[PDB]
Every structure is written in structure tokens, then in C-alpha cells.
Design a protein around this nucleic acid. Structure first.
Lengths: 240, 127, 181, 130, 283
RNA sequence: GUGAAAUUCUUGGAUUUAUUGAAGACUAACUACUGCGAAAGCAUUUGCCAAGGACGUUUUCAUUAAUCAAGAACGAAAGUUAGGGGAUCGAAGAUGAUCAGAUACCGUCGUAGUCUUAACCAUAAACUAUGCCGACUAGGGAUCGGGUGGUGUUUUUUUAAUGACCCACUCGGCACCUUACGAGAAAUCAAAGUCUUUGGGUUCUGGGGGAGUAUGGUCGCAAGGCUGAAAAAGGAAUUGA
RNA sequence: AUUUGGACAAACUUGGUCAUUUGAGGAACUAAUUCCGUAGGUGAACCUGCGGAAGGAUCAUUAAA
């Protein structure tokens, strides 16, 4: 309330005069995504200032943007996935970013979970060859055959446990043979879950098999050369 | 061609925030608030209030030079309710009307897997 | 300057969408000038506005809201009212949001909300000029702001356990006051 | 009054149109009907208990004429009003005056003290009578 | 409200009130006024307090014209925030929510009345008559029993009220101990509160609670400060050093392992005296 | 934050936003007239320790059985004693507002508790408002566990699994829908039935409401033992005489 | 530090003084929801915490393309 009768609290004793002009003192930076995706230029962000290059570099070394693969790749059918990128090396107005995580959208999760079937959630913690400790959550739902007549399609605890074991060993084999850039390259065109289906096709017919979430946990020693290669040097202009 | 912000629309049960930020949510641009545009406290969470709030924030965003926004609406979540209210709906309508380019709408409401107790007590909270 | 929006439809609300579809797209295209589509390969409705044909910027958002309400389970003409005006909202909540009820208690509570042959819910709707829909446990209320506030108020009292007789008495009191004003 | 626990026949769109647009039209309908049928009854009974022929009283859009008109058809209502009912005189608006019925206007200040007293005693006995 | 509907119980209240013709009677809750007229008949002076102008006016128009009008007085408004002059006898038919502060204001009243005939809830009156070792025994019971002597008079059913309420009532006789015993109200209150934080535990545990030792620490610290001496340094907490002090006093009293519901006034006062000696003051 | 407010916290930037971290509970949607258990009760993952019903069986002992006082085991929540931890909610309590209307009687803080180990307590509308064991007496589908058979899709093929669905049959469950040639005052009941008046075995139990009364039928619980006051029109009144 | 003598002397008392403000009579003038177990209660015609019960009123949508 800004009303006359909204009585003053200890509150409004000593204010501060709006003279700073923050979005005049601030500055614009543009970011770029790794070379796996197709559109690498996504959005711009703001840095408090540049008087402290300490401030500029530190803010943009802490930043983490979060985009949707549809925006990133041009195909609207990845609308429900949503990745997180964190920028860690900056140069010349232009930020270099690498993979940091995944998720779905809450709408899609609620959309998939229906009432007359079983849900299976598998949860594996692994580390890539790049020394990136990682955590992957997968889900699946027990669908039903083409000549079902039973109302529900429930799996037994035995089938559930078998499918969880299969999913765990597939995920860990894949992401221990892989590298993180290779991991995202696999994770884009929904190929791990195609494998999960094609492996569990004999225990129980499933549907909506998805790699629900990816989580970074530890990162190795930094590598600016690796970043620059992953993204696929300069002079000035003689001010006098 | 354009630039994108993220409009985080926190529609509490008795207030409304419309907080526009840059991508990565670090650099907040403009933040207004229900009562702040409506000088009372019955109406601090009213659709009219949120409408004015969103109009002003659209002004400030157009100041800074951001033309499109993704939007993350939100309810109070937690043990309390979990679905955005009329305040959030009003803010969204008003802003899309105001003519910033809306990109992608989401409902990031924190939904506890397994909540603690809620404020009501065994007999029930409201009334 | 074409501008798009997507909203999904659950299945049990996907049969009636087909059934009454032919009464749905005419208000979207003729009075809002809003190209429509239904991706039945993703179970969604997509509304996009043309750069030149549309006029009102907010037409797109009203259309999305109208289809969204129909999806949540309102009658077609009610949702059309949501299109016609500009000040109709939808508020949802849940019985566990009010008071933690378990199983048979929760079923009895939904019974007390509905009332025999829906007499209670219809009484509330007629009294406060709103539309109520019970989902399984979610309950949704469409109407003007203060009206849905009053409807929520009565409904929450019903959830806690006031018998429908006392609730109906309160309804008729507020109805007389609203009619006089 | 009473609420309606049956499902409403008209949706929100319609009820708001109605709010967008003699007490109860149903009340005047019933009133007119009962009046007509009572006229029928008194007809029947007058035929039965009179001595001389009595005819059936009557039978029971677009601009209409009025054949009966209880004025000479050239008299203006400005001329049918009488001066008393278009302007009597009443108590004066300013607190500084009293204005009797017969059109005198008084000023409380320019009256003498004895005049003040006599006007007083008159007002007192009037208010006492009432 | 609720209307009394028994002239026989009105007779009973007057009789067991046992008014003396030299007295002044403070009346709370006249109602329709039958008690008022009876007390004006019996006593010397009567003052009746009321908060509702409607029953006030109906009462005064019911009494006007009688010779007792010169002696009757009526005082309007709420009487918890006004001055109440001395009154020899008290009679109360008030709604209970004020009745508890009525009891405590009357006990705190300088020059307290001889006797007070009050109406209370059945449960509330059982609380006031709760003797030690009885389940109903409460801190309220302890306070009232050691500042006054209380005794039941009669029980009033819900059916004897128009309209009937659903909590049965009773009428009780409260006699302030004149003179008041020489003990500090605030210290005795602090003791009862600490011990009755949970009436069926052990007082040792009741002290073992946290905030009680914090408050006792602050009190003993300001006591030793105004006495101008310092304590021996504690390895852990000052709360803990006063805790061991309390341990010493509890063990020397041998009351640490007794039920607050079974301790009588005498044990409570002896414990308070031990605390007063050792230097602990709850207020 | 409520119906409405108010204490409260907020230039040493609160509410909000981003990135993290810790702490203790808790185990959402999937959750069904489905499962397990002696009942109370029991939902994240993997491992270990034993246990259990059902089903299959051309295995085995050969009456070892049923009902049962005493006693024992366990026994939700609250509660007690002693330790531990103490995020969340929160009897008592402390406080704000006491504004009509309670149609819309709450807000801030919070001891004890909630959580845990070791002992007590042993009660709930602990309900399927109905002792147990056995046998017979109606139709119908669905559903969970096991087994047998049939048939094609889903599956796969010298590696490690050979599972899902459909159909008939089948024991055993959680319940359900129709009806009883039966029973009952009726509601109803697959037992609350077992052809008119009665015997398959066995344990415990029995001989309405308010009122009005007598109490030796009996158990509790009280006080004081210096202390006292004397009739009005001698009106009402901006309304009168 | 301490010490002499004066005048000023705050402040107080006892007043005096003038000054200004502020109790019932006289006398004029003008104006007119029910319940169960346990635990607790001091703004208690009853309330609260925790776990239970119905012996408490079910409308709408719903296989699949």
C-alpha cells in the first residue's frame, strides 16, 4: 500500500536518492553455446560494470543461463526439455558456454503421469571419461498391449526391479564410455531412451521412456583449451 | 533480432510480484508489486493491481531495450497452494497486451515431493 | 509479427473436444482472427496470430485462456463467456490444500461439496454467478474476482464440514445482499 | 427469497447480458389473467341475476390510437393543473427568516423583541397542538 | 445472552449470600432485575455495573418510582478499566469470559469484600474447588486457594436458562482471607507458573526446561548485581551454574521428585522460602 | 496477514531473483472399492538377515486335532523416566486487534510435544457397532497370487534368461452386482439361513428412558473462636403552569 | 590546592505586594456437523493440540482413431 492511511512504520526514516542510473552504468554481453547445438548465439546478459574487470569476469564466471532445446536447435518438438548452460570463459563481449544440466518442464511431467499404469524411476550416479561426476534420472511408464482388455497395465515388483536394473546398467555403460560433449551429443536426439526401450522390450512393454534429468556434481580442473576447441588471438586498433 | 528477458510472475495468495530479469536471472531489471501500485491492502492482490504493475514493468523493460520475454509464473508453492492465481493471470494478460513479445510460458511452482506439516492444524486452516 | 501459443489437452477431455470442436473454432477465427490448429500427434492446440489480419494484441491471450478453461473442464458456452468479457478468471485448489483428508474422509468431503444431485454446487453457482467444476480432487472456479472469492469461501467451509443446510443459509443471505446492491 | 438448486439454464455470458440490459412481469401476467377471468365470472352472474340484457364485456406491436380520452382533446395539462398544487409556499430556506403560510416573509433580525416573542408563542402553541 | 428462569434459585442465592442490613453490595449482571430488587430490599447500599445500555435502561425504568431508587446506583460501561469503590458484598451473574478477571480483580481489590456469591461454569468451579491431589488441580486453583477460601453452594442445570446454554453451571461462595497473607504475588505467581508448566511432571524436570533456567539466570544475575557481588566463574553456562544451584536446593528440600498435582500449599511455600533464602527470585 | 486491520521485519537492502551449503523430518502425483500383516500397522533406492501365505508335489510322519480359565507376546495417538538430536508444525503461555457482522472469531512468538535410544503406561467409533471350529444350502462376472492347457501378436537368433497380452480351466484371496422356495417386527442378513416345537463340537454372558423419594449401603470434603449503618410536588419542564 | 573582602547572588522559607488565570448562591439581558482415546486450559455460556470414526448429502468428464 502507498495509501495515506497506511501508517508510517519505523520504516520510512531515511531513504536514498535515485541518482545512480543503473542501466546506464551497466553493460551488455552476448553469450554463445557449444558446438553440439545448432543455434549457438542465444540472448544477452548484463554485467554490473567494467571498472572492476574483477567484477566483469567474476560475474560472468558465476553466471548460468537456462534455455530450451527448441530455441537452441530450431525444432519445436524439443519443447519440453530444457538445458542449463554455464559460462566460464569470457572474451571480447562474447561468452563461451558449456553444458551444465538438463530437465523437463513441469507441464510435461504432469502430462505424462496418468492413472492406470505404473511409474518406474531409475537413478544412477556415474562419472564420465572427462571426470565430470554426473547424476541421471530416467523414468518410464508401463504401457499396454495392442489387444489389452484389462483396464490397467501394472507391472509386478519383480518386473519393476528388473527394468530398474537394466536402465541403471544401460545409463552407466553409456555415460562411462562417453565424454561430456559426447554425452550431450547423445542426449540431444533421444538415443539413450531408444536404447532403454530396445533393451526392455522383452520384460514388459513400456512407453514414454525419457531421461528425465541430468545433474552436474563435480567438475575437473578447468581447461580453457578444451573450451575453445569445444566451441570451435586478436589485436587492437592503435589508440594514441 | 530481438532480446529476451524472463518475466517471473509470483502470484502470491494475497500479493503479486512481477519481476523481470535477464537470462540467468542474475541481473534484475524492474520489480513492482501489487499494493505498491494499489494504495490499500484489500486490493494489494487484485487483478487491477497486477494489471497496473505489469503495465509499468513493460514500460521499464522497453526502457532498457528488451522486447521479448519468456515467462515463469509461480504460486506460493510449498505446503501452501500450488497453482497460480487470478493475480498472475491478470499480470500475464496485461503484459501480453502491452506488446512485449511473449516467448515461452512455464509454471515453475515449487511442488514438495514430501512436505512438512502445514500451518493449519488438524482441524483445518481456512474458516 | 506472427505470434504463437500451445496448450495441451488431457485425454478424457480430448474426446469432448472433438465432439464439440465445430462450435469452438468459429469464435476463435471469426471474432478474434486467430489461426488455429490441433496437433493430434502431440495432443495440443496451437493458436497463432497473423501479422496483418488480427487487430487486438490481447486476442491471442484470451483465446489461449478460453481453450485452457475448456480443457480444465468447463462447458463450452461458459468458456465462450470467458472469451466475450475481459474480467473473468479461473482459480483452482485442492482438498489437501485446505485440510489433510485421507481416503474415505476425502470422498465424503467431495460428496458434501457436490450435494445430492449436485444441488449444493448448483446453489453456489447460481448464488454467486460463477461456475464450479470438481475434478477428482482439484476444484476449479470460473467467475469474476470477488465472486470467485466468495465461492471459494463457501466451498472451504463445506470442506471443513459445515453441513449443507447452514451453508445454504449463508448463501441465501449473501445472495439477497448482492441482489439489493 | 429462495435460491435455485437446479442447474442454471443460461450460462455466464447470458446472465451478464441480462445484467447488461411494475415489479415482476409474471406478477402483471397473473394480475391481468385473474382480472379477465373475474370479469368473465361477474358477467355470468349478472346475466343470471339481472333482469335486462347485458352484453359480453369485451374480447380478450404497432402505434395505437386512443379513442377514449378523459380531456377535451384540446386542453393542455399546464391548463389542467391548479395553482395550489404547482406552488404552495413553505418554510424559508435561510435560517435567518421565517415564512408563514399567507406569503409574508419575516427576517428574524428586523423584528422587534415583542414581535419575536409573539411569533414565538404562536409557534409554541402550534407545536404543542401537533 | 441467557435469562434466568428460577425465582427459587434467586431466593437461594440471596439466602446463602446472607446479606447484613449495613452492607453495600456490588452487583454484576442484573439481567431482568429480580436480584436487584431483592438486594435493594435487604441491603443498605447497592451499586450495579452494566455494559449493555439496553438492559441498563430497562432496569432503571423498572425500578424508577420506588423509594429504593435513592439508594440504588447504576454504573455503565466496562468496569475492568474503571474504578470500583469499596463494597462489602459481591454478587455476580456475569458471562464467564469476564468472570475469571472478576475473580482476580476482586482478590486484588484493596479492602476486599467479606463474601462474594458468584455464578461459574461447572468445570470452572470444579477448578476453583480442586484440592491438591485431584485431577482438576490447576495453577488457578492454587492461587485462589491460597489467597482465599472457596466453597461450593449449588449447581445450576442448563435447562434452567432461557435460552439454555450447553455448559452446566454452579454458584460458589468466595471469601477473601482477611488480612491477605504476607507473600509476594509476583514471586508466588512465577513459582506456580514454572511448576505448573506441566502439572503431572517432576518439578526437577520442569526446572530442567530451557527458558525457565534462562529467566532464572537473568533474575539471579540482576539480584546479585543489585546486591553488588560477583559469582564464581562457570566452566560452561551461567544457566548451568544456577542450574546446579537449583539442584542443590531441590535436593535439600527433597521436593524435586514430587508431583505438582500432589504438592499442597505448604510444600509450595516451603519451596519458595528455600528459594528466597538461596537468593532465587522469580519476579 | 485477515472479513477487516494490527503488533512484527525492513537503507546495516528486507519480500523477491541467481548460485550454492547445512540441518532435521518427510516419501507427493503414479494411489485403485488393489497388495501385505496376528491386530495396531506398513509406500524413494540397493544390500544383508531371517520369517510368511497361497500355489505345485505319484515327498514325508500317521491323529499329533477343535474349544479353552491362569499367564504371556504385541498393542495407533497422547503420556511418564533417563539420554540424544531439535528444520517443521505446535496443548500451556506471552502478546497484536477487540472493528458492527461473526454472514467472513483470527495474527506474531513459542515451552512441552512431534523425531530417536532404553524402560513404563495398555487404552480408542482399536468397527465388518454381531464368540470360535466344521458342514451343507443361489446365479453372475471382474480382480490379485499360483499352476495347467490353447492360440497368435509382442518378443528373440550357441547365450545367459525364456517376460507382456488374449482365451478356457483352476485352487486361494480383497471386495462387488443380482436375488433369496430361507430368516426377521422391519431395516436388512450367503449368514442374522439350515423344511411347524428346537440335539455337529465348545467357552464366556443375561433374567429402556427421564424423572420424584429414602439412605445406617458407603466414601470423601468444610468453616469461625473479638467484629456492627439510618419522610419528601421541599418535583418534571427546549414538551410546563 | 588553599585563603581575604566586596558586589552579583541561584534557590528556600516567612510573608507583603501587584498582576493574570481558574467552587454554589444572588441578580439581569439576549437568543431558542455429531463422536471417540489422551493431554491441557485464567478475558471459559467453552476452547485447543495429536491419532482415529460416519453412527455425514457424488454433480460433470472418461476405452480407442
Amino acid at each position: 500500500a502507498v495509501g495515506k492511511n497506511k501508517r508510517l512504520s519505523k520504516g520510512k526514516k531515511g531513504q536514498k536518492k535515485r541518482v545512480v542510473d543503473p542501466f546506464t552504468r551497466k553493460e551488455w554481453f552476448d553469450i554463445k553455446a557449444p558446438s553440439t547445438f545448432e543455434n549457438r548465439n542465444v540472448g544477452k546478459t548484463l554485467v554490473n560494470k567494467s571498472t572492476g574487470l574483477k567484477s566483469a569476469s567474476d560475474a560472468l564466471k558465476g553466471r548460468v543461463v537456462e534455455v530450451c532445446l527448441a530455441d537452441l536447435q530450431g525444432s519445436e518438438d524439443h519443447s519440453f526439455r530444457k538445458i542449463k548452460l554455464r559460462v566460464d570463459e569470457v572474451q571480447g563481449k562474447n561468452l563461451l558456454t558449456n553444458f551444465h544440466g538438463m530437465d523437463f518442464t513441469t507441464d510435461k511431467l504432469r502430462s505424462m503421469v496418468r492413472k492406470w499404469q505404473t511409474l518406474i524411476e531409475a537413478n544412477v550416479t556415474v562419472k564420465t571419461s572427462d571426470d565430470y561426476v554426473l547424476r541421471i534420472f530416467a523414468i518410464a511408464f508401463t504401457r499396454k498391449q495392442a489387444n489389452q482388455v484389462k483396464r490397467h497395465s501394472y507391472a509386478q515388483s519383480s518386473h519393476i526391479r528388473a527394468i530398474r536394473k537394466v536402465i541403471s546398467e544401460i545409463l552407466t555403460k553409456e555415460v562411462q564410455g562417453s565424454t561430456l560433449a559426447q554425452l550431450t551429443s547423445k542426449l540431444i536426439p533421444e538415443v539413450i531412451n531408444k536404447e532403454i526401450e530396445n533393451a526392455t522390450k522383452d520384460i514388459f512393454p513400456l512407453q514414454n521412456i525419457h531421461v528425465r534429468k541430468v545433474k552436474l556434481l563435480k567438475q575437473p580442473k578447468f581447461d580453457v583449451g578444451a573450451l575453445m576447441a569445444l566451441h570451435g588471438e586478436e589485436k587492437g586498433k592503435k589508440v594514441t | 533480432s530481438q532480446v529476451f528477458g524472463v518475466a517471473r510472475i509470483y502470484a502470491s495468495f494475497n500479493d503479486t510480484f512481477v519481476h523481470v530479469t535477464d537470462l540467468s536471472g542474475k541481473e534484475t531489471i524492474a520489480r513492482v508489486t501489487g499494493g505498491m501500485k494499489v494504495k490499500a491492502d484489500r486490493d494489494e492482490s487484485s487483478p487491477y493491481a497486477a494489471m497496473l504493475a505489469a503495465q509499468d514493468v513493460a514500460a521499464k523493460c522497453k526502457e532498457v531495450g528488451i522486447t521479448a520475454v519468456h515467462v515463469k509464473i509461480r504460486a506460493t508453492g510449498g505446503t501452501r497452494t500450488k497453482t497460480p492465481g487470478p493475480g498472475g493471470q491478470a499480470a500475464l494478460r496485461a503484459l501480453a497486451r502491452s506488446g512485449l513479445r511473449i516467448g515461452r510460458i512455464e509454471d515453475v511452482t515449487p511442488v514438495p515431493s514430501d512436505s512438512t506439516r502445514k500451518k493449519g492444524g488438524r482441524r483445518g486452516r481456512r474458516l | 509479427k506472427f505470434e504463437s501459443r500451445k496448450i495441451m489437452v488431457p485425454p478424457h477431455r480430448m474426446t469432448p473436444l472433438r465432439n464439440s470442436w465445430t462450435k469452438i473454432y468459429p469464435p476463435l477465427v471469426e471474432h478474434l482472427k486467430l489461426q488455429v490448429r490441433m496437433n493430434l500427434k502431440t495432443k495440443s492446440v496451437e493458436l497463432r496470430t497473423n501479422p496483418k489480419f488480427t487487430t487486438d494484441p490481447g486476442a491471442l491471450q484470451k483465446g489461449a485462456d478460453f481453450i485452457k478453461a475448456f480443457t480444465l473442464g468447463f462447458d463450452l458456452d461458459d468458456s465462450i463467456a470467458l472469451l466475450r468479457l475481459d474480467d473473468l478468471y479461473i482459480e483452482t485448489f485442492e482438498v489437501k490444500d485446505v485440510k489433510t483428508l485421507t481416503g474415505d474422509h476425502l470422498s465424503r468431503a467431495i460428496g458434501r461439496i457436490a450435494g445430492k444431485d449436485g444441488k449444493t454446487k448448483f446453489a453456489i453457482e447460481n448464488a454467486t454467478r460463477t461456475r464450479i467444476v470438481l475434478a477428482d480432487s482439484k476444484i476449479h472456479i470460473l467467475g469474476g474476482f470477488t465472486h470467485i472469492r466468495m465461492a471459494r469461501e463457501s466451498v472451504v467451509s463445506l470442506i471443513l464440514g459445515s453441513p449443507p443446510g447452514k451453508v445454504y443459509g449463508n448463501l441465501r443471505t449473501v445472495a439477497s445482499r448482492l441482489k439489493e446492491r | 427469497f429462495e435460491l435455485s438448486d437446479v442447474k442454471s439454464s443460461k450460462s455466464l455470458a447470458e446472465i451478464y447480458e441480462d445484467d447488461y440490459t411494475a415489479l415482476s412481469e409474471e406478477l402483471q401476467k397473473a394480475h391481468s389473467e385473474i382480472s379477465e377471468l373475474y370479469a368473465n365470472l361477474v358477467y355470468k352472474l349478472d346475466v343470471l341475476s339481472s333482469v335486462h340484457f347485458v352484453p359480453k364485456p369485451a374480447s380478450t406491436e404497432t402505434p395505437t390510437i386512443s379513442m377514449e380520452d378523459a380531456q377535451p382533446l384540446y386542453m393542455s395539462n399546464a391548463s389542467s393543473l391548479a395553482p395550489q398544487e404547482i406552488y404552495n409556499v413553505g418554510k424559508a430556506e435561510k435560517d435567518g427568516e421565517i415564512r408563514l403560510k399567507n406569503g409574508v416573509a419575516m427576517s428574524k433580525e428586523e423584528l422587534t423583541r415583542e414581535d419575536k416573542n409573539r411569533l414565538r408563542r404562536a409557534l409554541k402553541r402550534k407545536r404543542s397542538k401537533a | 445472552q441467557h435469562i434466568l428462569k428460577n425465582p427459587l434459585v434467586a431466593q437461594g442465592i440471596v439466602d446463602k449470600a446472607q446479606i447484613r442490613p449495613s452492607d453495600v453490595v456490588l452487583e454484576v449482571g442484573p439481567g431482568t432485575g429480580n436480584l436487584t430488587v431483592r438486594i435493594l430490599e435487604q441491603a443498605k447500599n447497592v451499586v450495579a455495573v452494566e455494559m449493555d445500555p439496553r438492559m441498563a435502561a430497562e432496569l432503571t425504568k423498572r425500578v424508577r418510582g420506588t423509594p429504593v431508587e435513592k439508594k440504588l446506583e447504576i454504573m455503565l460501561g466496562d468496569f475492568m478499566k474503571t474504578e470500583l469503590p469499596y463494597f462489602d458484598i459481591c454478587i455476580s451473574n456475569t458471562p464467564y469470559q469476564i468472570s475469571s478477571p472478576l475473580v482476580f480483580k476482586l482478590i486484588n481489590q484493596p479492602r476486599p469484600p467479606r463474601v462474594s456469591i458468584l455464578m461459574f461454569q461447572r468445570e470452572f468451579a470444579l477448578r476453583l474447588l480442586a484440592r491438591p491431589g485431584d485431577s482438576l488441580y490447576c495453577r488457578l486453583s492454587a492461587n485462589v486457594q491460597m489467597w482465599a477460601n472457596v466453597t461450593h453452594i449449588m449447581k445450576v442445570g442448563k435447562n434452567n436458562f432461557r435460552p439454555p446454554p450447553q455448559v452446566e453451571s454452579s454458584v460458589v461462595r468466595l471469601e477473601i482471607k482477611n488480612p491477605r497473607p504476607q507473600v509476594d504475588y509476583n514471586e508466588w505467581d512465577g513459582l506456580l507458573r514454572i511448576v505448573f508448566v506441566r502439572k503431572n511432571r517432576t518439578i526437577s524436570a520442569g526446572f530442567k526446561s530451557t527458558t525457565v533456567m534462562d529467566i532464572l539466570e537473568k533474575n539471579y544475575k540482576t539480584f546479585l548485581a543489585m546486591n553488588n557481588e560477583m559469582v564464581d566463574d562457570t566452566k560452561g553456562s551461567m544457566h548451568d551454574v544456577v542450574k546446579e544451584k537449583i539442584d542443590t536446593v531441590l535436593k535439600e528440600t527433597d521436593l524435586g521428585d514430587k508431583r505438582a498435582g500432589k504438592c499442597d500449599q505448604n510444600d509450595f511455600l516451603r519451596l519458595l522460602y528455600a528459594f528466597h533464602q538461596v537468593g532465587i527470585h522469580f519476579s
